Design a protein around this ligand. Sequence first.
Ligand code: HEC
Ligand code: SF4
Ligand code: SF4
Ligand code: SF4
Ligand code: F3S
Lengths: 52, 929
Amino acid sequence: WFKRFRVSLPWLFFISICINIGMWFERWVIIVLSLHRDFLPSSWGYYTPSVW
Amino acid sequence: CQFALKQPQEKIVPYVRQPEEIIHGRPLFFATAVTFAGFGVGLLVESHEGRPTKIEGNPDHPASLGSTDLITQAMILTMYDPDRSQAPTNAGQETTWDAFVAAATAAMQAQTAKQGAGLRVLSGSLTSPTLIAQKQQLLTQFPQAKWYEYEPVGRDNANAGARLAFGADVHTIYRLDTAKVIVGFDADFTAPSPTGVRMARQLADGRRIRKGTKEVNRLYLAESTPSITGLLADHRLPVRSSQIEHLVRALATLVGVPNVAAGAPLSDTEKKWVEAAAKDLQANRGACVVLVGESQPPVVHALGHAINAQLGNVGSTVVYTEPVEDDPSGGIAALSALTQEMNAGTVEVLLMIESNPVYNAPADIPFAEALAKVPLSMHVGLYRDETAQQSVWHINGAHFLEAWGDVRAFDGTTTIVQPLIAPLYNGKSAIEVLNVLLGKPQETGYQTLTAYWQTQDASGNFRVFWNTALHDGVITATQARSRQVTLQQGFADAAPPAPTQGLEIVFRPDPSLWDGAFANNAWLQETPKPYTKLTWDNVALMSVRTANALGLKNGDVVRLTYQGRSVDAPVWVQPGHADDSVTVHFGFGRTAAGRVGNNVGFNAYRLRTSATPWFGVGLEVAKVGENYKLASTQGHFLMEGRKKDLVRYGTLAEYVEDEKFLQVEKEEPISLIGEYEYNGYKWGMSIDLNVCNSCNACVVACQSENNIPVVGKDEVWLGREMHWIRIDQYYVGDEHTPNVYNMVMLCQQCEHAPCEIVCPVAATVHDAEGLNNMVYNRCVGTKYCSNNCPYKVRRFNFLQYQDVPYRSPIDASTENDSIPVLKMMRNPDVTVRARGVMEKCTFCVQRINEARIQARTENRRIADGEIMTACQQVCPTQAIVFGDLNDPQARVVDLKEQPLKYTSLDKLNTKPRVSYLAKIKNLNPDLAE
Ligand code: HEC
Ligand code: SF4
Ligand code: SF4
Ligand code: SF4
Ligand code: F3S
């Protein structure tokens, strides 16, 4: 909202680098947190990713 | 990634002399039986040409009424195991079979110089009349020879209790079809026992709840650990396994037993349980039964016959017959009388029919050091076991599909074990190995089987009698004669000692792997254990209150220190369990099982002490580990408010006032997609959840029928088990005394299937018959069907899941190369699936089509019993009922108009073909508070 953190490129970079990490986490919350726990409790998984 | 422009030149070979009976493409069922403990289960196994591919139940047989156990069903992968002993082995290196009959007969002429002294045999608890007649020929040719019968889950205390109350040994055949209450006492009788399929049908026949049913079974249990009868128990009590000798002494005094001498008092919830279980025993005297399993000492087993003779059950539901097994007074004490004879010489020949006592012996019985003192140790078993390395000689086993044999079931009914296939590796069964020791080495297994039944047939025309016995399976000219008994007095006069404080150990057989004889079976391993849905791990079962006192979570490795031995056990906490009563399971820790059962759990047999062989109170837990793997396959054992959608549970007190009290009389849902018209062969399924004891026989029969791959322990922990049908425990209530409810969750074959609309290449469509068609060759592998499937009954092949306990699935060096002997166990009507396709319960569409197409050639329609799926043909309780829904006089159209018919997830408009009959758990008025 403030121009103090929009014209200042060391502040706009930290804001935008927290969106690429953060909007990855939105698509993690949408995909994994809806899939790993669902209707039936006997099909509740975790998805810790591997190296690949 | 296999790739070619053409498939290679497929050779089609005929026979060279095609036998008359074989039609290529037709199943050709054969009537055999399996020696489980010593008794027959009775089988109807499907041999396509020579190879048996699917074990079913022999519906003529008394034990299995057309339905097998979990272990009995998975004897096909044991048959086609590549880890089976392919050749005899002499002192480590391989050899021939006729080198054995030149070494054994050279040791049999040295025994006739003596009075056959060093000729001990260590078979396991056999009941078969041909091996009894061969033993009684062996013990009359060699006078001082001894036949010891060791069985780790033998009926040792069950027969010592029959000696302690009746004098001589008597066999006890229970009969639950005339039984209103069944007051068990540490008796998992619906387990894989020699009578577990009949005692599960007779218990479930009493509680078939219909539109006009007012009286069902009750099943007071009082179990040590949560056992699979506790799913059918309505008043299961977590007793410490040392107080069950004192609950019966509190129940034998409420009924009339004069010399009970009760002691060691009870708690406020074990005493109000036993004043109400015995109050329902003094009523309905003609139809009631008190059961007690071999975990208990021989005194309470004798008291269990004292109560059943007081209440007048003898002749009504507890019949007493002559003992079907040959040596009932020989068990662990027979193994201990052999090693003290095996020490300091004085034994020269030790035949070991399939027992595996190097692995199975108690710690107080030094069978390892007593072995290799025998100069000629011979072993007969279908695996190179823990004993076969420590034996001098070793023979193949001739697994019962390969060998001519007999077996006697309970009720005494003999059933002939025909070979469905010739021995792949030349097996030389137990009837053929005693032929070498007797002196007839060229006599085949068939030549000594009909030599016995020609002399045990007092009728004429033996060829009609013999061919009918192979056809029907059963004989029933040989049933065990009912014995008049006495019930002698003055047997429980001695007061018991003080109940010793301390944390108790409890020994159990695992329902999957009974005593480690089938620990090399991949179908039994990945099949989830009944309460604690684990696959490849022995665990130490603790209560929630026991682990809270010791301070250990659901995955810590503890070093369970018994009287002198430590075992280094992982921990699985368990809500239904008793306090301070840590339970370990047999069947694990095998060091020479093969490639499946090598080093999967901890060997619980190193803690048996042969004086406390099932439970003892001197345990020290002493946690020494953290964060074990423990590949479980459930995710959440707690119904999270999803009742009305998973297991609708009620009692009979509220069902006799309101029929549809668990139904929701709601308005018809609105669907924008319209609907389709299913007018011919509408296929639906009704799963009666009230009678499912979570036996897991339907999990492993879908596996044997639908070619489902086994998945190793590392990929079950990632939730990639391949199981088309699953049973779901849910643990409703208090975390110390809960109610455990099963939901048999398979593919519901949804009419408005959400898994189909999300398939880009249309690899999942419907029939006009109505069931969901998962076509594997079209699946490109986009796992979106699994995401939109609300029940998550879709199961993706992630890696190349094929022969996974024999090659780890994280390689492509053997991805498209398969084990040749495992190819014979596969059903030829189900696609053996590739690396990246998804699976689903297809209502056994290869069984639907093979009788739909056959009913079209003969221009008729399918009847009701013509199509019976694999999960339906295996369920001992007959919980699953499949059939036509457009047939008005069908069996599933009655079961889907019952007042307990509910579908899972009707909040979504999937419109399933699978409806569930709800659970009603018959609570007593004096105990429901
Ligand atoms: C070459 C691949 C091919 C396959 C695979 C195939 N058909 Fe058929 N098929 C039929 C007829 C007619 C029926 C009988 C339909 C019925 O009875 O409902 C049938 C039925 C079937 C059935 C049995 C359906 C059931 O209810 O059991 C199967 C399976 C089948 N076809 C498979 C005419 C054909 C023709 C026509 C010359 C061709 C070519 C043909 N079919 C080619 C093929
Ligand atoms: S129950 Fe699941 S797998 Fe079966 S048709 Fe419906 S969405 Fe598909
Ligand atoms: S009916 Fe379906 S779930 Fe049941 S055994 Fe057959 S394939 Fe498996
Ligand atoms: S449905 Fe039948 S086979 Fe499956 S767990 Fe229940 S009782 Fe056992
Ligand atoms: S959506 Fe379609 S192609 Fe394969 S795994 Fe799922 S089916």
